[PDB]
Each structure stands twice: as structure tokens, then as C-alpha cells.
Amino acid sequence: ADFKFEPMRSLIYVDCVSEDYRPKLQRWIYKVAIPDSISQFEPYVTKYAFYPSFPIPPQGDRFGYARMQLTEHHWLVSDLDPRLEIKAIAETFPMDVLVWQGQIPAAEGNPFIFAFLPMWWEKDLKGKGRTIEDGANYRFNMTIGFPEGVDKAEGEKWLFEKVVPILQAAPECTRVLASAVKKDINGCVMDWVLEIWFENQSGWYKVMVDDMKALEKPSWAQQDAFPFLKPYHNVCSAAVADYTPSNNLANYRGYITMR
Amino acid sequence: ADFKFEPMRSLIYVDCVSEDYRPKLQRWIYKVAIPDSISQFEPYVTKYAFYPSFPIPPQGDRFGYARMQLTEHHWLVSDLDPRLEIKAIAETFPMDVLVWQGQIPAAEGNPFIFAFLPMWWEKDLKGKGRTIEDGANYRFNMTIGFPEGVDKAEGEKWLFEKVVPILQAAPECTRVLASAVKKDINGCVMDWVLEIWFENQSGWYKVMVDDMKALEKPSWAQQDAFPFLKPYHNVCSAAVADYTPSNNLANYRGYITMR
Amino acid sequence: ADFKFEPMRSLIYVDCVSEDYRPKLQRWIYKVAIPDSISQFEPYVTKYAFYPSFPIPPQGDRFGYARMQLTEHHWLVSDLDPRLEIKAIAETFPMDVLVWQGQIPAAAEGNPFIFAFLPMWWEKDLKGKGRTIEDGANYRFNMTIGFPEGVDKAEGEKWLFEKVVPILQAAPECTRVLASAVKKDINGCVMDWVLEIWFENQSGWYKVMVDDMKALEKPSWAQQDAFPFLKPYHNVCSAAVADYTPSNNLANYRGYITMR
Amino acid sequence: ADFKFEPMRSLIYVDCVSEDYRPKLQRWIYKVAIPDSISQFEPYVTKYAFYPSFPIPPQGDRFGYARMQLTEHHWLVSDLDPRLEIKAIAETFPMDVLVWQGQIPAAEGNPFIFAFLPMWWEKDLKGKGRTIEDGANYRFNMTIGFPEGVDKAEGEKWLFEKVVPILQAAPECTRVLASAVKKDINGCVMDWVLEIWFENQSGWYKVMVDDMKALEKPSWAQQDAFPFLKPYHNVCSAAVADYTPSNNLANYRGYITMR
Amino acid sequence: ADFKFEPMRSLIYVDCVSEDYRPKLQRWIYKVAIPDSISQFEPYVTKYAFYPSFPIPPQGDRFGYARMQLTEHHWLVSDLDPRLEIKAIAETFPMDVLVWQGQIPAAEGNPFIFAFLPMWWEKDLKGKGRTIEDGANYRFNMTIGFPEGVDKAEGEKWLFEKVVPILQAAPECTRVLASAVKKDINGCVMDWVLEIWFENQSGWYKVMVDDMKALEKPSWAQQDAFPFLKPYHNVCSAAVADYTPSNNLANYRGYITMR
Amino acid sequence: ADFKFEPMRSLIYVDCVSEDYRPKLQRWIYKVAIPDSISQFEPYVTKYAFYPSFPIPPQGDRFGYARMQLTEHHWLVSDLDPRLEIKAIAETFPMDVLVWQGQIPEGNPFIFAFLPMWWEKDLKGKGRTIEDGANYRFNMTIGFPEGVDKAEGEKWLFEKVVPILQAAPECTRVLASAVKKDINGCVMDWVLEIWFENQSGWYKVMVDDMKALEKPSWAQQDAFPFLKPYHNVCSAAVADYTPSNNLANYRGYITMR
Ligand SMILES: O=C1c2c(O)cc(O)cc2O[C@H](c2ccc(O)c(O)c2)[C@H]1O
Ligand SMILES: O=C1c2c(O)cc(O)cc2O[C@H](c2ccc(O)c(O)c2)[C@H]1O
Ligand SMILES: O=C1c2c(O)cc(O)cc2O[C@H](c2ccc(O)c(O)c2)[C@H]1O
Ligand SMILES: O=C1c2c(O)cc(O)cc2O[C@H](c2ccc(O)c(O)c2)[C@H]1O
Ligand SMILES: O=C1c2c(O)cc(O)cc2O[C@H](c2ccc(O)c(O)c2)[C@H]1O
Ligand SMILES: O=C1c2c(O)cc(O)cc2O[C@H](c2ccc(O)c(O)c2)[C@H]1O
Ligand SMILES: O=C1c2c(O)cc(O)cc2O[C@H](c2ccc(O)c(O)c2)[C@H]1O
Ligand SMILES: O=C1c2c(O)cc(O)cc2O[C@H](c2ccc(O)c(O)c2)[C@H]1O
Ligand SMILES: O=C1c2c(O)cc(O)cc2O[C@H](c2ccc(O)c(O)c2)[C@H]1O
Ligand SMILES: O=C1c2c(O)cc(O)cc2O[C@H](c2ccc(O)c(O)c2)[C@H]1O
Ligand SMILES: O=C1c2c(O)cc(O)cc2O[C@H](c2ccc(O)c(O)c2)[C@H]1O
Ligand SMILES: O=C1c2c(O)cc(O)cc2O[C@H](c2ccc(O)c(O)c2)[C@H]1O
Ligand SMILES: [Cl-]
Ligand SMILES: [Cl-]
Ligand SMILES: [Cl-]
Ligand SMILES: [Cl-]
Ligand SMILES: [Cl-]
Ligand SMILES: [Cl-]
Ligand SMILES: [Cl-]
Ligand SMILES: [Cl-]
Ligand SMILES: [Cl-]
Ligand SMILES: [Cl-]
Ligand SMILES: [Cl-]
Ligand SMILES: [Cl-]
Ligand SMILES: [Cl-]
Ligand SMILES: [Cl-]
Ligand SMILES: [Cl-]
Ligand SMILES: [Cl-]
Ligand SMILES: [Cl-]
Ligand SMILES: [Cl-]
Ligand SMILES: [K+]
């Protein structure tokens, strides 16, 4: 019988690998994914939302920048409980979506990154007490997973002892938050999620490219420059606004077409 | 102090024993039951909905067909916890409602069937992977309880080894789902709930009447024909659509009268 | 340029000619019709609603009883203005729907699409003025009628109000009587009158609309032996509905969410 | 046939003549009036709202201060068109409500003031360009009607040439707005509606009592002090906030009771 | 990792120490507090609501009468879990609010009373089975905490064996409910919350002042008359209606200004 | 007294002249503009919506491509009636917004076009439903330069430009309405919506197929659309659906966690 109370926030990194796909992918998301999703998890998900990503910044490609959006669930139970595999109605999820997101080509293909977190950030490392009145945030959400055969403790150490200090040093960076990915849920390859706030694109660039040149290149690096990880495979990211109109449990009133 | 996290889906089988009662019963449900209900359980029920039943099919009477609707709650806690018996405001629930539903007459009445289930089906026995795009479903929801002094294991065996195979054999039947009733909650007499999908009434009839003639009549049978159980006492049912507008936690905006 | 302020209530009489069609028709209505409709007229329709019909009563067939629902719009402008024919996105409205509703017979003769325009308020209040909702639940029998070809409209009117209505007023089982004249100038609808006639329940309806109405003289233009003396689904349609619907679509619709 | 496009804002001044009545009156308003109202005018009213009145200030009684609320409609057509007298369902409006509001006593009662206006203010006389960011407003809405046999032109002149200048002189007064009442609609006795903003009660008092002592007492005065008009008969008023949660066409989800 | 399922109803007693503050405080609550709050706890709070308090009755000051409102949350988890201290965006909560509520004097200064309860009343002591149809309720919600060095068991005994019987004796009192405050959550000084229903203000007065004169004055009393406790410090209260339009999770559509 | 029933659809072409401005402009729109707007016109506007623009396509700059969104109102009355100038509460609309949109730095006009609520001309793709697939909806407005006969401009548009659209299978729809110049003296004359399947289709037709066009004598640039970007032409490409249907959807400026 028993089901465990397991309150979590999940993030899905939705890419769009080509502008010609964007209409079609966006359609599927707002016309199909939403109702199909709510139809299943309404009773045990307290918040379902999409945060469309800002235009990819210079060198965003190197950070596995998701060119469509972040998809964000708040669960009361583990969606990976085997018992939850059974659904009266199943979702309509064509191959094409995987093409559009870049999981498949038509190029090598790219994993589907679905990270589970506690509902609250584990580490507040810069900008505690910042209110919304303090101004609009360029919120750079980035997840990372250390390559195979790299001790996780060492990766952690690198992240917090070498990377974060650079963020703290930069006045252009207004906030730093981190949570450890719950690997015990769906075997997601990622280890950490961070959100790193700037004022704008230029701030992001200055810090995440230029300030990060100062970093020692680690021996396990999969690219020459920070983040030293394979785009879309061991790192994904998006820059998003403070607010989304796509708070789907409250806001969705059907797929009403423009006139 | 402590309250157990106990996520469940419940079903109430609401009959209407006479067309002359229908206006009055429907009024009570939508004018009174909804606000009275929400007023009590809003904070610990994630979904409250009514699925009005399709017109009773031929020989539906023999299946304890609920001629008004299904009432459907999703609980986060056991509503039968004794501590939940205390309410500031109590509901308005007159005798007349029980007359209308057939719990009372005006020479014997019919029990109130209130079945608690896990939030997800335990057994998927036909039609896995069916999406909503596959077409409109005549969803025949049926619950059953084996008569007194009938070994539950034998009843189970009969159901899955004799009844279900007939459902699987019939191309007219698109889906079969089952959960065991949680008897430990409110001593509901029912043992199983199934949902059995057809394309329409004629499909339902063909299978649930005609194909079921082939069944051996068991020694505990309370009627000659399948389902071999006492209508409204050891079997209730309803046929409903895939969709209801009465998703009460989202949709209810008062008892607005037509003009 | 100019567009006329033309506030109206319309009614569409949606039949379902067979129980095997009901799932499919209902699907189309709630999954497709709603979004397609709102997508077009949201800015100039103040209220869009469906009132599902109660189970067809005995001899309801003779009154063109719509076995699915009433569809109800409140317009700010005439939807039949020619300029409103142009739509960026068009609706998905397959033949099959017409089969299901009974406009087409599929593969004798089908049944017209009855789409009646009215003023937003009833023109005639003939019984039960001042009745509140506290007075109890209503079996609301909405019925529209059109007098056959070559029947003087004035005479039809006279018959309706001087012969039919008095029977309704005589019956204690009948709690309310309302009528409006159909706006024929809008979409050439064949109907002339819409009435709503309230009872307590089905039995009341039957007693009055069948039994009390036997007393009526059969008029010379009658298209059937018994009241309403008009061709089912062609010169008369009807539905019995509740006081309340959850399908108030402009407020309530949150997508086609499926049961679990 | 034809119906005139007649876009108007109306105000009803709802008093509560005794604290013992307040529960009962408030109940009727939110439990009964709202649904009954929407049930009638949903299709031709674009906004229906209640603005509960702040606690009656010192000497508010002399201004016909409505101790319950303002009721506010936005019409597309004249509700006094005779054709609109016909309604399928009628409202439940007991005598008691009139007692509670003070239309009836137990030694003389008070008229029901229902004033129709254009949807936009006709005169902006102080504080043009004030935004909501400029701070919270004590919004003193007051309507007045000159006694019988008082030339309307003279009344107008008095109002704008003697009264208003005092408002403009007072720094405590942040805003002044006025519209002429549409007398042609429902024969309302009132001639003008003004809204006069302060920072708070004390500001209101300073200006509307103390500064107004300087006013010449006119020969038609029905009381010694400004506003020189018979409370609740030739003057009503309320002080309200910038925002109400009772925006009934959007917000109402039934009469849900506290737990 | 693990987070405890901890379903609770909390109450905050919001005072307004001066009518000149009321506009400003009300503004902050509805313009700022709501969005700031929802922005944080939407996923783990099932109901967030304000119940504005009726006008302070005679001698209400002696009961720590909250002159603005009750603030009411329903939690799924303890908000005092240390891990919940971390928020991406923090709330805007100026000093001024504390002045307005009376926590600071800008007069002696008064604690912020934030009481956690089970979601259901622990004791039903009068009026069980009362429905909303039985009439409108003057709901007097009162919380109390016994002064320092007063045995809690004795306080309890006094409350239930001496105070409550007076409530039961009075036909003017329609309902009595009580829950023990969860002291283990946020060290709230209060021990009990009761709701005590009347028909109106006069009923309240008759019982809570006049009938309560009959009470023996205990040796620990901090004032001469019942409730024998220090206003706003060891007792707070409010009288509220059965219904509020400020059911914020459902109803809030922005801070829309009147016209 | 009397107010004229004047049902109209308006479009505002909201640019964002720099990515560094985008956070700030977007904030103002969703945090401030919405409530300020609804607070004023709720009773006489039936639909208020934002359609965020797709990423600017190649050579979009030449079409006055609005890099933030389209803003879309449906009015029951003329918002330019002088009597509607009076508001209890006024909007917060700082200079900075005009900088961000590009009205202020040469500087670019504020394009606010009023239309009938229904398209006047349906020139390709009549009867297309939403089931026919997702649309790249290229909304473009144009105004002929000063001293250019309007009749000739019209003729050019419908007899030379549109036929190229009709010829292209990549173009699924063509719609046009004449701008109501009598309302707010908007400089634009026409609004068209022109549908494609995607960006590449748009480009193929609106750049490559349009090379075939004779360059008119009044042209303000060498290539189609032959009009001054952001001044005599603005445009946006948008989706069939927006979540920002503000009268229904807005529940406050709730921040991500
Ligand atoms: O929005 C969603 C979404 C999406 O936007 C893009 C995508 O590529 C996959 C998706 O899948 C999400 C999902 C997660 C967990 C579930 O259990 C589920 O049924 C659906 C869905 O909600
Ligand atoms: O959780 C999952 C999921 C889901 O629950 C719901 C849903 O609507 C889509 C989904 O899509 C995920 C997926 C698809 C393709 C892949 O290649 C892959 O690795 C993962 C799957 O894992
Ligand atoms: O709280 C309750 C309730 C309610 O809140 C609202 C309402 O509209 C009906 C109700 O009735 C429920 C009920 C449960 C079991 C029974 O056997 C029964 O007869 C009634 C009761 O639990
Ligand atoms: O809709 C409802 C309902 C109904 O439709 C019909 C009916 O006969 C009883 C009902 O009672 C339901 C209920 C069950 C358990 C509870 O604990 C409760 O509070 C309410 C109520 O929700
Ligand atoms: O716009 C329309 C429309 C729509 O948008 C959506 C929808 O689901 C059905 C519809 O049906 C209407 C209709 C079609 C054909 C007729 O012959 C007729 O009288 C009415 C049509 O006008
Ligand atoms: O619900 C609706 C409906 C329906 O249920 C059944 C049906 O057979 C036709 C319908 O058509 C309605 C409609 C009428 C006029 C229009 O101009 C329009 O756009 C749509 C639609 O709204
Ligand atoms: O339709 C109306 C109405 C209503 O629909 C609902 C309701 O709750 C109250 C109402 O009261 C209004 C009214 C106006 C003037 C009066 O003098 C009076 O007694 C009542 C009336 O216009
Ligand atoms: O809120 C309302 C209201 C009220 O609060 C108090 C009151 O004393 C009368 C009222 O009557 C309003 C109303 C006015 C004109 C109408 O035509 C109508 O139908 C209703 C109603 O809406
Ligand atoms: O409405 C609210 C509120 C209020 O009205 C008045 C007040 O003086 C403080 C407040 O604070 C409440 C709150 C409690 C716990 C939290 O964790 C939180 O984030 C917010 C807030 O919801
Ligand atoms: O969690 C809390 C909280 C919060 O999260 C958000 C918010 O907007 C207000 C809040 O108010 C509470 C508070 C404020 C000041 C105090 O002096 C005090 O004792 C308590 C605090 O408990
Ligand atoms: O009321 C108005 C308004 C508003 O309420 C809210 C808002 O966010 C912007 C606004 O802007 C409108 C406007 C401003 C400047 C212009 O140059 C122009 O053409 C239009 C103004 O009319
Ligand atoms: O959202 C809107 C909007 C906008 O998004 C961007 C912008 O640059 C100006 C704007 O102004 C719109 C508006 C136009 C005319 C009015 O009279 C009014 O009150 C408001 C407003 O609604
Ligand atoms: Cl700001
Ligand atoms: Cl590299
Ligand atoms: Cl009873
Ligand atoms: Cl389909
Ligand atoms: Cl038995
Ligand atoms: Cl057994
Ligand atoms: Cl039998
Ligand atoms: Cl009743
Ligand atoms: Cl016959
Ligand atoms: Cl709405
Ligand atoms: Cl402020
Ligand atoms: Cl007089
Ligand atoms: Cl006097
Ligand atoms: Cl501060
Ligand atoms: Cl009552
Ligand atoms: Cl103490
Ligand atoms: Cl004392
Ligand atoms: Cl909601
Ligand atoms: K480096």
C-alpha cells in the first residue's frame, strides 16, 4: 500500500535545435503536453510551469543552452515509483519531439535531462535577502554532471572551492544558489543544479566566459573552456525571467488561437 | 499529533431512482454539496469532481447502474481518521437525498457505496498505451463485493481467470483496469473496482451481456446472469465520458441560474 | 466601417440521434467546438454555455427533443454580418457531426439545423413572475416552433396565446411560462417563437403537454395528430434542462482534461 | 427591437444601520446577492464589484456614510429599459435587507441611492497624473442632490466655485474628481458624484470638517455644517481603498465557509 | 533528505493600531504580501486566506482584538523547518508594517502572534452539527497563553472547568471549539485557540463581559476582568464572518485599482 | 453624453533594441503594464493579450521586426475619444520604456494601429483550421511614404506583392485590413498577416521570391519591402497561441523559486 511523502521540484531542459522546428515544438508543448500532463498528475502535483528561455547568449552552445524552455514540476510523490507507471490515458509524445529537442537527429543525439531536487535550495552562496524590488534578474539556471570515473567528492570540491569563488568575486553576479540532484530517483547523470543571477546577457558573458578564463583546466575536462563539460550531455542551462505566464495549473484555459 | 500521508482516490456511486427526483437531486449536488464539501476539505483534497453517468443502457439495472453520477475525491489523508469527524460547519444533507439516491424507500433500500482506492490502478489488463487521440471512450466503471461467507481468494480467482479473459477476447473492449478496494478505511463491502472501456453502448451490451452468457453460473450467485451479484448492494456501476466540466475545485463559480 | 450594436441571445438545438453516437458527439463538443468557438468570438460574445438536456421524456420525440443539449450564445453583434464570415483560423466541423445531430442520415431525409436568435430578455412573462430560485428546482422545458408554409403568422400567434398558453396557466403543475419572438431578419430561421415552460418534473411535463393538451382542437394545418401539431425537428424542437450548468464556457473551460 | 448602447458606471450606497445587523446583511450580500445578480446580468455587465467601506470616521453620520460598502456595476445598456424588467429567475431580496440598510425603520427611513454615471469622470480637478505607485489612497466617494426648489445651475456653481477651491487649497487632499449624475435613467435625486482622496481619516477630517467651516452657510442648507444636506437623503458617501478582492465577475467561487 | 508530512492550520493575528495606518497596511497586505507569499509557498500550501475582522466591539481592546484581520495558512510541511529558510526571492517587509500592526511604537510594543494548529479542531464543546443554514455567525476567534510560571495543566483545567461552562450556559453562544497550540513549531507563547460563536456583537458582549464577571479572579491574573491576561501579549482575538472573498490562492488576479 | 459603439482590434509593435534591455522591458510589461492597463479599461475591453515575437529572422531588421512582442487590444469604444483621457489612477510609463523600445536613443515612432475586429480581405488559405498544423504568423504593417498616392500604393500591394505570396507554396495564408487612420493618425495604411510553416519559408518568399519585384520610385530601401524600417514598416512573427491572455490569465507577478 504505502506511498512516501516525497516533496520535490524537478527541472527538464527543453532544447530546440533549429528555428524551423520552433513553431511545431511550441505547438506540441502548449496544445498537447499541458492537457496530457494535467490529465495524469493534477492530484499529486502542486505546480506545473514553463519558463521560456531568453535568446541564446554568445557561447551559450558551450553550456548546453536549452533554446525552448525550462519545464518545472512540484511533486508530492516520486513520479518514478513503479506503481505510477500505470495510467488510464497515456500522453501523445511523437518521435518528432525528440528530433526537435535534439534527443535524436534526422549531429549526434543528446540525452533527456530530467533532474529532481528538494523543493528548497540547499546552498545559498550569494545574494541572500534579495527581493524582487531589487530589480529584474537574468536567471542563469545550469546543471552539471561529472564525467565517468570522476570521483564525485572531487567534482563537488572543485565546484565550491574554485568555481563559486569567481562568482562571488564578480559584482555583476547578484545571486548564487545550488542543490544536489537526487540521483536516487531516475538515475539522472547530473550532480548539481545552480542558479546564477546577473543583470543581463553582458554580465553573464563577462563572468561565465571572461572571468572563468582564470580557471585551471581540470584533467577530466571535455572542452577547453569553462564549463569543461560536454554540451547538452554533462551540462545544460537556460537563462529565464523572474516571471512566467505559463503557470499551467492555474492559467491554462485551452489552446485558443489568435485571430 | 501525527497524521498519516495517505493518498487515495475515492468513488461514490450516486443513483437517481426516479426521473421525478432528478431535478431535486441534481440541485442539491450542484447548489449545496459542492460548497459544503469544499468548505470542509479544500486544504487536503487535491481534486473533487463529478462524472455524470450516460443514460442507463439495456439491463443496466442488473449492474447497480448509478443513474446520476460518479463522485470522485483525491485525498491526501484518510477521511475516516476519527479526528476528522470534527467540523466547525457541518454539511446540509437531508433525508430526502437518501430517498432520491435509493438508500431509503417511501420494501428495502440500498447501501451507500463509498470505495477508497490507491490513486493509480493496480492492474492494467488490456489496452496499455492507449492515448486520448485513439478516440472517445464509453468508460464502464464497475465495483463488486463478494457475498458473505465467500472466500475472497476464490472470488478474486473467478474474476481474473474467468471474467477478465472474456473482456480480453472481445475486440469491442478497448481497455481493462482494476484496483483492490481498501477495506481497512471505511469497511466498504466492495472488493474490486474495474473500469472497462468500449466504443459505445452497443459494445458494452455485446460483451457484458451476450459474451458473458458463456459464463458458468457460480454457486454463490445472487442473480441468474452476470454479474451474478445483488444490484446496488454487491455491485454498482456507471458509464461515463473521458471528460467532465464538473472539476469542482477549479471550475465552480457559484450556482448561476439560466436566464 | 460601422458595426451595429445588436445584443442577442441565440439557441441551438443539438440532437443526438443514437446512443452509439453520444461519446463521439460529446467529445467533439467539449474537445473541439469550445476552443474553436472561443478562438473566434471571445471579443464580442459575453456568454457561451451548454445546457445538457435531461433524458428524453415519454413522447419527447414528437417535440423534436434535442437529446444532447442546448447551445447558448450572447452576442454583442449579428454573427450573420457578412464581414464576420472571414476568420483567420476556421473551425473543425466534420460531416460526421451532422450525422450525429441528425442533419444528415449517412451512407430518407434529414433534419434542419435550428439556430434561433432572440433579444437578450424575454418579451412575454405569462406565468410565474417573481419566482426565485429558492422556490425549488425547475424542469425547464424550452421549446421553439415555426408555423408551416402558407400559414398566416398572425393566426399562428393567436392560436398559441389564446388556445395553448391558457392550458399552461390552468395547470398547477406548470410553474412558469415565458416567450420571445424569433428574430427572423437575422439568419432566416424557420421558427417564429421560443417558449420556456417550467414544471416540477417529467411527470408534470407529461400531464400537461400530453394529457391536458388532448383537449386542444386540432388545427387545419396540423402536421401530426397530437399537440404540438408540428413536424418533429423541422417545425418544432425542444429540450428540458436544469436551472444550472457547469459548462459556462467563457469562465469555466480549462482544457479537455481526461479522467484517470 | 433596437437596444441602445449605453455604457455606464453605477454606484449603490449600502448602509448598515447597526452592528448587530452586520453579519446578516454581509451574509445576504455575499451568499445571495452575488449569484442572484450574475444570474441576471452576466451578458451585459462587464464589471460587478463591492468596495467595503472603511470604519465610519468622526462626523461621518453627517455625510450619509454607508457603513457596509459601495456596490459598483458597469453596464452596456440601461438597466431601467422597461424590457429588462422581465427575468426568468428573480432575486431573493427580503424586507429585512431594507431594515438593515435603513430604508425601513422600527422613526423615518432612508432612500435607496442608486446613481448612474458615464464610465469616465467628467471633471479632473486635482491630482491629474497620480499613479498607484504614489501611495495608498483614502478614497472619499460622495454624492449629493440639491433640495427641492434649488436652481441646479446655482448648486453647480456653489459646488465648483466655493467647495472645490477649498479642496484644491488643502495639501492633505491628493485628488478631486466629479461626474454629473444621469437623472434621465432612474430619477435618482442626486446631481453630482465626487471622489476626493486623502492620505487617511485625519486628512479627511481636517479638510471636510475643519477647512469647510470657512464656508458660507447657504440659504437652502438642511444642516448647519458642510455638506449642508440631509444625511442619507440628499447626501451619501463612503471611504474605500484603491483595491477590492470582491471583483465578483472574476473572483466569485461560491460561499465557502471558514473552518 | 527527508521532509515530514506535517499538515497544519496557522493563524496570524494582524492588528492595526490606528485608523490613519489602515490604508497603508491594507495596501501592503493585498499589493505586496500576497504575491510575495505565493511566490514562495504555492507548492506546499493548499490554502492561504485573509478574514478581515469586524469592527472592534466594546472592551475588545482587553482581548487583544486584531483590528485588521486574521491571516490563515494551511501547510503540508513545517514552515519552521530550517531548510525552508532559503528562498531565491525574499519578501518585502518594511519596518513600517510592524509599526502599523503595533509590534513597534514609532505605546509599549506587542509580539507577533503566529499560532500553529492541527487542521481540525481537537475539542467540539458546543453546537456540534450546526450547518450554515442555521444562520450567520459572529465568529470570535481567541488565542491565549498562560503567564510565566503558571502550571499549564492548571491553566487548562481552569479554562475547561470554569470558563467554558459559562459559554455552555449562555444560549447567546452558538458554538465552542478549541485546539491546543503546537508549541513545538515556532515557540509561540499561546497555549490554546478557541472559536466562540455568537449571533452578533451584543451576544458577544453579554457573555464575554457580563456573564464572565461571575468568574473568580485567579491569582495569576494580569488584568481585573476576564480574560485576566495581558492584551495583545497573552491574549489576541478577532471576530470574523463565515466567508471571506480573500481566498488568495484561488482569487488573486493582481492589485487592480478602482476607477 | 452619447458614446459610440466602435468595436476594434488594435496592434502595438513592441521592439526591444538591445538584449541588455530585455529583462527590464519584459519586467515592466508583465509586472506593471498589465495591472495598470486592466485597472483602466477592464469594463470596455473584451480582450487584452501579448504575443511574444519569435527570434528575429535573417534580414528581419529590414522589416521593422519588433523584437519583444505584439500587444493586442479589443475595444468596444474608441480609446482616442477625448473623454477617455481622464483616469482616476494613471499608468506608470517611464521614459526608459521608450529607450528600450527604441522610440528614444535618431529614434523610432510608436506604432499603434486600429483595425476592424475582422479581416477585410482573405486572399489565400481560406478554410485553414488549426488541425492543419503550426503557423509562423508574420504580421506586418506598412505606410506609404509622404506624397505617395494611397490608391497607387494599394494597387502595387495587391497587384504586384500579393501575387508572389499566392505563387509560393511555402505561404499558407494571406490576410489584410486597412488601418483606421481616422482614430489616432497612425501613419500605417495596411496590416497583413502572412503565414509560413517556418523561418526558412518566410525567408524564401519575403526575401528571395521578392527579389523579382520591380523597385518602385518611392522606395526608401533597395530591397522589398522598400520602406523605412520601424518608421514605414513594422512586423513580427508569432505563434498561433499565447499564454498571455491577460484578462483571463493574469494572477499577479509571481516569481520563480
Ligand atoms: O511538460 C512536460 C514536458 C515538456 O514540456 C517537454 C518534454 O520534452 C517532456 C515533458 O514531459 C513532462 C512530464 C514529466 C513527468 C511526467 O510524469 C509526465 O507525465 C510528463 C510534461 O509535463
Ligand atoms: O520521464 C520520461 C517522460 C515522462 O514521464 C512523460 C513524458 O510525457 C515524456 C517523458 O520522456 C522521457 C524520455 C523520452 C525520450 C528519451 O530519450 C528519454 O531519455 C527520456 C521519459 O524518461
Ligand atoms: O462530510 C461529509 C459531507 C460533506 O462535507 C458534504 C456533503 O455534501 C456530503 C457529505 O456527506 C459525507 C458522508 C460520508 C459518508 C456517509 O455514509 C454519508 O451518509 C455522508 C460526510 O462525510
Ligand atoms: O460531492 C459529494 C457527494 C455527492 O455528490 C453525493 C453524495 O450522496 C454525497 C456526497 O458527499 C461527498 C463527501 C464525501 C466525503 C466527505 O468527507 C465529504 O466531506 C463529502 C461530497 O463531496
Ligand atoms: O463559426 C462557426 C463555428 C465555430 O467557430 C466552431 C464550431 O465548433 C462550430 C461552428 O459552427 C458554426 C456554423 C457552421 C455552419 C452552419 O451552417 C451554421 O449555421 C453555423 C460556424 O458559424
Ligand atoms: O458550441 C457550439 C456548437 C455546438 O455545440 C454544436 C453545433 O452543432 C454547432 C455549434 O456551433 C456554435 C457556434 C455558433 C455560431 C458561431 O458563429 C460559432 O462560431 C460557433 C458553437 O459555439
Ligand atoms: O434587479 C435587481 C436586483 C437583482 O437582480 C438582484 C439583487 O440581489 C438585488 C436587486 O435589486 C435591484 C433593485 C434596484 C432598486 C430598488 O429599489 C430595489 O429594491 C432593488 C434590482 O434592480
Ligand atoms: O450587488 C448588488 C446589490 C447590493 O450589494 C445591495 C443592494 O441593496 C442591492 C443590490 O442590487 C444590485 C443590482 C442592481 C441593479 C440590478 O438590475 C440588479 O439586478 C442588481 C446587486 O447586483
Ligand atoms: O499574508 C501574510 C502575512 C500577513 O498578512 C501579515 C503579516 O504581518 C505577515 C504575513 O506573513 C505571512 C507569511 C507567513 C509565513 C511565511 O513563510 C510567509 O512567507 C509569509 C504572509 O503570507
Ligand atoms: O516566516 C515569517 C515571515 C515570512 O516568511 C514572510 C513574510 O512576508 C513575513 C513573515 O513574518 C514572520 C515574522 C516577521 C517579523 C517578526 O518580528 C516575526 O516574529 C515574524 C515570520 O515568522
Ligand atoms: O493609458 C495608457 C497606458 C496604460 O494605461 C498602461 C500602459 O502600460 C501603457 C499605456 O500607454 C498608452 C499610451 C502611452 C504612450 C503612447 O505614446 C501611446 O500611443 C499610448 C496610454 O494611453
Ligand atoms: O500593455 C500595453 C502596452 C504595452 O504592452 C507596451 C507599450 O509600449 C504600451 C502599452 O500600452 C497599452 C495601452 C494602450 C492604450 C491604452 O489606452 C491603454 O490604457 C494601454 C497597454 O495595455
Ligand atoms: Cl521597477
Ligand atoms: Cl573545445
Ligand atoms: Cl432531514
Ligand atoms: Cl478527434
Ligand atoms: Cl452478502
Ligand atoms: Cl477470504
Ligand atoms: Cl435473477
Ligand atoms: Cl432547498
Ligand atoms: Cl401523428
Ligand atoms: Cl474569468
Ligand atoms: Cl509602496
Ligand atoms: Cl428635498
Ligand atoms: Cl444641523
Ligand atoms: Cl524597512
Ligand atoms: Cl438565509
Ligand atoms: Cl508573562
Ligand atoms: Cl486592569
Ligand atoms: Cl484556480
Ligand atoms: K581556462
Residue numbers in the entry:
A (entry chain B), B (entry chain N), D (entry chain L), E (entry chain K): 1 to 106, 130 to 282
C (entry chain M): 1 to 107, 130 to 282
F (entry chain A): 1 to 105, 131 to 282
What does the published report state?
The bacterial chalcone isomerase (CHI) from Eubacterium ramulus catalyses the first step in a flavanone-degradation pathway by a reverse Michael addition. The overall fold and the constitution of the active site of the enzyme completely differ from the well-characterised chalcone isomerase of plants. The quaternary structure is a hexamer with D3 symmetry (trimer of dimers). The tertiary structure of bacterial CHI (polypeptide with 282 amino-acid residues) is separated into a catalytic- and solvent-exposed domain, both with ferredoxin-like folds, completely different to that of the plant CHI, suggesting that the enzyme activities convergently evolved from different ancestor proteins.
In this study, we underline the catalytic activity of the imidazole of His33 by comparison of wild-type CHI and its inactive His33Ala variant by crystal structure analyses in presence of taxifolin. The diffraction data of two CHI_H33A crystals soaked with DQH reveal electron-density maps identifying distinct substrate binding in the active site and the entry tunnel. The inactive enzyme binds the substrate in an identical position, as found for NAR. The superposition reveals a root-mean-square deviation (RMSD) less than 1 Å for DQH and NAR, and all substrate-recognizing side chains remain in the same position. Thus, the hydrogen atom at C3 is in the same position as previously described for catalysis. The C-ring of a second DQH forms stacking interactions (3.5–4.0 Å) to the B-ring of the substrate-like positioned DQH. The second DQH points with its A-ring to the position of the truncated imidazole side chain 33. The B-ring adopts the position of a helical turn (residues 121–125) of the closed lid observed in the NAR complex, and the C-ring runs through the centre of the salt bridge Glu91–Arg125. This artificial and less specific DQH binding is in competition with lid closure.
